[PDB]
């Protein structure tokens, strides 16, 4: 499996700061075996895609579930392709838990994006009250089942596990805890989809990753990379891209 | 009150179709006394603003309530200004009822955009069951209270009434709500703000009905949906002349 590092800029960006990030990425020494993605705010997707070499993927942070229609404020996968972007992040914990997106909606968006020819980073993960009730697998598997319900092919999917129970609380997840979830998710893929897909699919870690912990997380056998948050805006991003080499 | 016509493109747009719409706007003769706005999808805001003469406003169809933060998929008023756009539509019925935005969130976004120097079309309106229950005013006034609560200045606000309940809305029904909202502004904000604020109609607006709607004394323009993608938009922009 090819190591995969995606930088989610979240709601951060400006012509000035984007240019500084692009110059940092363009000039950095990055492991040639790392697949690298950045996800700017939607206003900046076309310009960031023009300025950054195709060695870098550029992703939207969200999209909707049909090509066009009466959905004020939404953008479709067809529009993403029209501006040269071939990736989207769907189901991020902030969209599920702050902006109230349901499992079913995330699954419908994922299936439509794939149908349009857009690759998807599909995000899953459980909150603290769910983890403390023993529901880590139940929650992760329910979110994946909603994606599988509408998907017939997985070659253009990357799964991101977000330990929301740690992100939202200030707790720190150990590399052993991340590995344990990644393994359970991979076994679900083996069981519900196929051993070949489970063997191929990248499962990336979306808890807090900085230059300080990326190398120990990267060595875990079922962690295939990272969905990076705030470190995506900083020189730490380069060390994270290099975490596996 | 200066007549105001906004075209909400919703989730419609592409480089090719945007170019046809931009050429349509550019070749049009529009009443010089009418304020005209278009709202493309967020991906296309910088290019549309670059390509359209500054006689036209270019608006986002949504934004968030702080300048930056951990809100994957959201954009801020600061970003809008950074790409040259100084307008946003907030509280549209599709965002309230499909995408689950609360009254409080719409009010927070509206106050923040205004504080950031972005002008706001703030949308209100009642659903069919609410209208049939006699709750048009109750709903509209509850929505305006959340918008009004933390606003101190109204010169950069336009109110859009969307009869989500429509069925067909008559010019008498639109006038009745616009008048009620204006009288609410008189008592809750001030008579001076009420006399000057634009209240635009955002129900189904076509070339066939825009002139009858425009003559109503408390209808100050339109927030147009599907007709904003068609040459019919120009006739609607010219409805007051």
Author numbering:
A (entry chain B): 5 to 249
B (entry chain A): 5 to 170, 175 to 249
The publication says:
Triosephosphate isomerase (TIM, EC 5.3.1.1) is a key enzyme in glycolysis and catalyzes the reversible isomerization between dihydroxyacetone phosphate (DHAP) and glyceraldehyde 3-phosphate (GAP). The overall structure of OvTIM is similar to that of other known TIMs in that it contains 12 α-helices, three 310-helices, and eight parallel β-sheets, forming a classical α/β barrel fold.
We constructed four variants, including a SAD deletion variant (ΔSAD), variant in which the SAD region was substituted with AAA (AAA), variant in which N115 was replaced with Ala (N115A), and double variant (N115A_ΔSAD). Therefore, the SAD motif and intramolecular interaction of N115 as well as the bulky side chains are major stabilizing factors in OvTIM. The overall stability of OvTIM was also affected by the SAD motif and N115 in a complementary manner in that the Tm decrease in the ΔSAD variant was rescued by N115A substitution.
